[PDB]
Amino acid sequence: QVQLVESGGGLVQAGGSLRLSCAASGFPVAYKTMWWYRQAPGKEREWVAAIESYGIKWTRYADSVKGRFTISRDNAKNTVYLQMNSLKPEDTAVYYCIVWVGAQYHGQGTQVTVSA
User: Fold this and answer.
1) Continuous segment of H or E residues that includes residue 93
2) Contact, 76 vs 19, CB < 8 A?
3) Angle 32-30-103 from CA coordinates, rounded to 5°
4) What is the CATH number of the domain that holds 33?
5) Would you say the C-alpha torsion 29, 33, 36, 39 has a positive or negative sign?
6) Where are the beta strands (DSSP E) in 40-78?
7) Domain total for the chain?
């Protein structure tokens, strides 16, 4: 019943921007803390950003993306967004959103490729 679906990835050149979406279903997005993470091919998973559930606002970013990425939420559309500006090739990876409703639930991921 709980389902996350990432989208918005693609192929851009260094310096461009993307906007990832995490469409949630089977539960209300606004009442859960959600994270974005990413996994590059030859490496292991890296936390990217987090947004606190509704009540006291709190957003957090990995140091390597702070100032370039913005996480935000649309409670009506039940969606979490990651605005990514000033993209670098080091940002190339599959991006996932994750929430814990008892267990953890993540999506299939969305591919972000940044060419130099």
Assistant:
1) strand 93-101
2) no
3) 25
4) 2.60.40.10
5) negative
6) 46-51, 59-61, 69-74
7) 1
CB distance 98 to 34 below 8 Å: yes
Q: Counting every residue, how long is the chain?
A: 116
Nearest CA to 40 out of 111, 107, 97 is that of 111
State the residue range of the domain holding 56.
Answer: 3-114
Resolution number, Å:
1.9
Question: Which of these, 30, 43, 35, lies nearest to 96 by C-alpha position?
Answer: 35
Contact status, residue 37 vs residue 96, Cβ threshold 8 Å = yes
CA distance 51 to 30: 10
| Cα atoms found within 13 Å of the Cα of residue 25, Cβ hemisphere only | 6
Q: What distance in Å separates the CA atoms of residue 73 and residue 91, rounded to the nearest whole number?
A: 22
89, 14 in Cβ contact below 8 A?
yes
Instruction: Quote the tokens at residue 96.
Output: 């996932």
How was this model experimentally determined?
A: X-ray
Q: Report phi then psi at 107, rounded to 5.
A: -90, -175
